[PDB]
Design a protein around this motif. Structure first.
Motif, PDB file in Angstrom:
ATOM      1  N   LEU A  26       0.698  -1.155   0.100  1.00 42.97           N
ATOM      2  CA  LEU A  26      -0.039   0.031  -0.076  1.00 42.97           C
ATOM      3  C   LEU A  26       0.889   1.267  -0.096  1.00 42.97           C
ATOM      4  CD1 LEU A  26      -2.663  -0.876   2.618  1.00 42.97           C
ATOM      5  CD2 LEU A  26      -2.735  -1.528   0.278  1.00 42.97           C
ATOM      6  N   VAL A  27       0.605   2.052  -0.969  1.00 42.06           N
ATOM      7  CA  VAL A  27       1.392   3.300  -0.873  1.00 42.06           C
ATOM      8  C   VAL A  27       0.282   4.610  -0.992  1.00 42.06           C
ATOM      9  CG1 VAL A  27       2.982   4.770  -2.459  1.00 42.06           C
ATOM     10  CG2 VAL A  27       3.075   2.375  -2.364  1.00 42.06           C
ATOM     11  N   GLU A  28       0.388   5.427  -0.028  1.00 41.02           N
ATOM     12  CA  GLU A  28      -0.602   6.510   0.140  1.00 41.02           C
ATOM     13  C   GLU A  28      -0.040   7.825  -0.376  1.00 41.02           C
ATOM     14  OE1 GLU A  28       0.635   4.955   2.737  1.00 41.02           O
ATOM     15  OE2 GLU A  28      -1.101   4.356   4.059  1.00 41.02           O
ATOM     16  N   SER A  29      -0.684   8.744  -1.163  1.00 46.53           N
ATOM     17  CA  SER A  29      -0.115   9.862  -1.886  1.00 46.53           C
ATOM     18  C   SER A  29      -1.246  10.904  -1.541  1.00 46.53           C
ATOM     19  CB  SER A  29       0.109   9.783  -3.181  1.00 46.53           C
ATOM     20  OG  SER A  29       0.739  10.919  -3.885  1.00 46.53           O
ATOM     21  N   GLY A  30      -0.870  12.166  -1.669  1.00 47.21           N
ATOM     22  CA  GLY A  30      -1.774  13.150  -1.768  1.00 47.21           C
ATOM     23  C   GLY A  30      -1.826  14.149  -0.371  1.00 47.21           C
ATOM     24  N   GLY A  31      -1.170  13.817   0.605  1.00 48.02           N
ATOM     25  CA  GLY A  31      -0.981  14.486   1.828  1.00 48.02           C
ATOM     26  C   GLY A  31      -0.253  15.786   1.463  1.00 48.02           C
ATOM     27  N   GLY A  32      -0.272  16.953   2.504  1.00 51.92           N
ATOM     28  CA  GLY A  32       0.194  18.195   2.136  1.00 51.92           C
ATOM     29  C   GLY A  32      -0.050  19.444   3.079  1.00 51.92           C
ATOM     30  N   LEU A  33       0.066  20.477   2.838  1.00 52.96           N
ATOM     31  CA  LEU A  33      -0.140  21.782   3.662  1.00 52.96           C
ATOM     32  C   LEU A  33      -1.398  22.369   2.980  1.00 52.96           C
ATOM     33  CD1 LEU A  33       0.559  23.540   5.946  1.00 52.96           C
ATOM     34  CD2 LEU A  33       1.835  24.869   4.360  1.00 52.96           C
ATOM     35  N   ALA A  34      -2.467  22.221   3.831  1.00 48.11           N
ATOM     36  CA  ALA A  34      -3.842  22.867   3.697  1.00 48.11           C
ATOM     37  C   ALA A  34      -4.286  24.059   4.531  1.00 48.11           C
ATOM     38  CB  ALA A  34      -4.805  21.992   3.423  1.00 48.11           C
ATOM     39  N   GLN A  35      -5.123  25.023   4.117  1.00 43.26           N
ATOM     40  CA  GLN A  35      -5.396  26.021   5.171  1.00 43.26           C
ATOM     41  C   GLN A  35      -6.852  25.556   5.446  1.00 43.26           C
ATOM     42  OE1 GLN A  35      -5.706  29.972   3.624  1.00 43.26           O
ATOM     43  NE2 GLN A  35      -6.327  30.980   5.488  1.00 43.26           N
ATOM     44  N   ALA A  36      -6.990  26.002   6.780  1.00 45.14           N
ATOM     45  CA  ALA A  36      -8.403  25.664   7.141  1.00 45.14           C
ATOM     46  C   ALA A  36      -9.663  25.995   6.251  1.00 45.14           C
ATOM     47  CB  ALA A  36      -8.839  26.450   8.794  1.00 45.14           C
ATOM     48  N   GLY A  37     -10.717  24.839   6.089  1.00 48.48           N
ATOM     49  CA  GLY A  37     -11.506  25.166   5.188  1.00 48.48           C
ATOM     50  C   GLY A  37     -11.315  24.550   3.727  1.00 48.48           C
ATOM     51  N   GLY A  38     -10.026  24.184   3.590  1.00 48.86           N
ATOM     52  CA  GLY A  38      -9.468  23.790   2.384  1.00 48.86           C
ATOM     53  C   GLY A  38      -9.794  22.328   2.235  1.00 48.86           C
ATOM     54  N   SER A  39      -9.284  21.734   1.145  1.00 46.83           N
ATOM     55  CA  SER A  39      -9.643  20.098   0.777  1.00 46.83           C
ATOM     56  C   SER A  39      -8.407  19.593   0.329  1.00 46.83           C
ATOM     57  CB  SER A  39     -10.839  20.202  -0.120  1.00 46.83           C
ATOM     58  OG  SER A  39     -10.443  20.715  -1.518  1.00 46.83           O
ATOM     59  N   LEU A  40      -8.239  18.078   0.575  1.00 49.10           N
ATOM     60  CA  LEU A  40      -7.207  17.486   0.123  1.00 49.10           C
ATOM     61  C   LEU A  40      -7.927  16.237  -0.323  1.00 49.10           C
ATOM     62  CD1 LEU A  40      -4.609  17.506   2.951  1.00 49.10           C
ATOM     63  CD2 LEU A  40      -4.452  18.556   0.565  1.00 49.10           C
ATOM     64  N   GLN A  41      -7.046  15.512  -1.214  1.00 48.21           N
ATOM     65  CA  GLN A  41      -7.507  14.118  -1.900  1.00 48.21           C
ATOM     66  C   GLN A  41      -6.283  13.178  -1.556  1.00 48.21           C
ATOM     67  OE1 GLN A  41     -10.307  12.978  -5.282  1.00 48.21           O
ATOM     68  NE2 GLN A  41      -8.358  13.546  -6.116  1.00 48.21           N
ATOM     69  N   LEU A  42      -6.611  12.335  -0.747  1.00 48.44           N
ATOM     70  CA  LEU A  42      -5.573  11.301  -0.771  1.00 48.44           C
ATOM     71  C   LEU A  42      -5.829  10.149  -1.676  1.00 48.44           C
ATOM     72  CD1 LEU A  42      -5.020  11.360   3.255  1.00 48.44           C
ATOM     73  CD2 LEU A  42      -4.450  13.092   1.336  1.00 48.44           C
ATOM     74  N   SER A  43      -4.530   9.250  -1.987  1.00 47.69           N
ATOM     75  CA  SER A  43      -4.774   8.106  -2.864  1.00 47.69           C
ATOM     76  C   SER A  43      -4.269   7.097  -1.962  1.00 47.69           C
ATOM     77  CB  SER A  43      -4.484   8.290  -4.148  1.00 47.69           C
ATOM     78  OG  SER A  43      -3.221   8.596  -4.208  1.00 47.69           O
ATOM     79  N   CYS A  44      -4.439   5.923  -2.444  1.00 51.17           N
ATOM     80  CA  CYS A  44      -3.839   4.713  -1.706  1.00 51.17           C
ATOM     81  C   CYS A  44      -3.769   3.680  -2.967  1.00 51.17           C
ATOM     82  CB  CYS A  44      -4.531   4.134  -0.575  1.00 51.17           C
ATOM     83  SG  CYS A  44      -3.820   2.553  -0.160  1.00 51.17           S
ATOM     84  N   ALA A  45      -2.847   3.385  -3.393  1.00 50.11           N
ATOM     85  CA  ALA A  45      -2.401   2.369  -4.390  1.00 50.11           C
ATOM     86  C   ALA A  45      -2.160   0.982  -3.779  1.00 50.11           C
ATOM     87  CB  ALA A  45      -1.549   2.896  -5.524  1.00 50.11           C
ATOM     88  N   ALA A  46      -3.136   0.011  -4.126  1.00 49.52           N
ATOM     89  CA  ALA A  46      -2.802  -1.399  -3.614  1.00 49.52           C
ATOM     90  C   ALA A  46      -1.847  -2.313  -4.842  1.00 49.52           C
ATOM     91  CB  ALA A  46      -3.882  -1.840  -3.085  1.00 49.52           C
ATOM     92  N   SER A  47      -1.106  -2.884  -4.372  1.00 50.21           N
ATOM     93  CA  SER A  47      -0.754  -3.915  -5.282  1.00 50.21           C
ATOM     94  C   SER A  47      -0.322  -5.225  -4.655  1.00 50.21           C
ATOM     95  CB  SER A  47       0.861  -3.301  -6.171  1.00 50.21           C
ATOM     96  OG  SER A  47       1.759  -2.976  -5.108  1.00 50.21           O
ATOM     97  N   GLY A  48       0.214  -6.337  -5.560  1.00 50.22           N
ATOM     98  CA  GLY A  48       0.141  -7.672  -4.894  1.00 50.22           C
ATOM     99  C   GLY A  48      -0.912  -8.278  -5.095  1.00 50.22           C
ATOM    100  N   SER A  49      -1.257  -9.301  -4.225  1.00 44.67           N
ATOM    101  CA  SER A  49      -2.062 -10.244  -4.261  1.00 44.67           C
ATOM    102  C   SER A  49      -3.395  -9.680  -3.486  1.00 44.67           C
ATOM    103  CB  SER A  49      -1.853 -11.598  -3.459  1.00 44.67           C
ATOM    104  OG  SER A  49      -0.755 -11.995  -4.228  1.00 44.67           O
ATOM    105  N   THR A  50      -4.111  -8.873  -4.314  1.00 48.10           N
ATOM    106  CA  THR A  50      -5.196  -8.249  -3.938  1.00 48.10           C
ATOM    107  C   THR A  50      -6.840  -8.568  -4.134  1.00 48.10           C
ATOM    108  OG1 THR A  50      -5.769  -6.991  -5.959  1.00 48.10           O
ATOM    109  CG2 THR A  50      -3.884  -5.967  -4.454  1.00 48.10           C
TER     110      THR A  50
END
Ligand SMILES: CCC(=O)N(c1ccccc1)C1CCN(CCc2ccccc2)CC1
Ligand SMILES: CCC(=O)N(c1ccccc1)C1CCN(CCc2ccccc2)CC1
Lengths: 113, 113
Positions: free
Chosen positions: B4-28
């Motif tokens: 599992l590899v997460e992406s999309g975190g970062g610095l946001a201001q209050a009231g803003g929005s983020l979109q995290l992703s998680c890529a799964a690989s292997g025997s899923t």
């Protein structure tokens, strides 16, 4: 190869309370989450409440504040305390096991101001 | 053997929005549930949102209405849309896979009157 046996169902009067039990046996050492579902007449089966090995719980909006999920780790039993029952709670209640797996490396979220 | 590899975190201001992703690989192929957790500094990692292979979702009380978990089964990717961020959302966010098992026979509850 985990076995689950639900008990405690029956006829209840509106506004009353029931306590359902789910006895898990077999190779349960890997099981670190348990869930209660219900299938109301004519509808899809839906998660009602779940609990993990840390003791955290989560509930569906339809039962939140009314139902309580708990566990007796010493006997591998999960309990669903159902309060303030209505006719809309009529359903087959099902217990389900879960093996929650590995985590990712994580991603940092920092919210300013 | 699931990665599992997460992406999309970062610095946001209050009231803003983020979109995290998680890529799964292997025997899923056996993986039929995914969850997003967060670990704020000094505290235990805690469930934020989860989704199963039938599209059912559940959220913690603190994020309901703000966060949305979704999935791309064709690419084995789960997403966490994080809206209306507050400073209390600052944490490392983790993705996690799960295998939910079979059902019991269930127990019937009938609520009268
Ligand atoms: C949230 C669930 C959870 O984590 N569990 C659970 C599972 C089903 C129903 C109630 C609780 C644990 C599963 C394992 N049992 C240990 C059994 C045992 C004892 C001695 C040697 C080997 C195994 C502890 C409870
Ligand atoms: C709710 C979770 C869930 O059911 N899964 C999932 C797991 C992680 C992330 C998004 C979804 C499925 C796991 C197996 N894949 C299938 C086949 C395949 C293999 C390789 C690439 C693309 C497709 C379907 C989705």
């Amino acid at each position: 190869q985990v076995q689950l046996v639900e008990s405690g169902g029956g006829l209840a009067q509106a506004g009353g309370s029931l306590q359902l039990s789910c006895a898990a046996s077999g190779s349960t050492s890997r099981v670190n989450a348990m869930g209660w579902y219900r299938q109301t007449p004519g509808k899809e089966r839906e998660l009602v409440a779940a609990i993990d090995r840390s003791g955290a719980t989560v509930y569906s909006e339809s039962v939140r504040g009314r139902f309580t999920i708990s566990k007796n780790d010493a006997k591998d039993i999960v309990w669903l305390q159902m309060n303030n029952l209505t006719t809309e709670d009529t359903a087959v209640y099902y217990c389900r096991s879960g093996v929650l797996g590995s985590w990712g490396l994580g991603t940092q979220v920092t919210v300013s101001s």
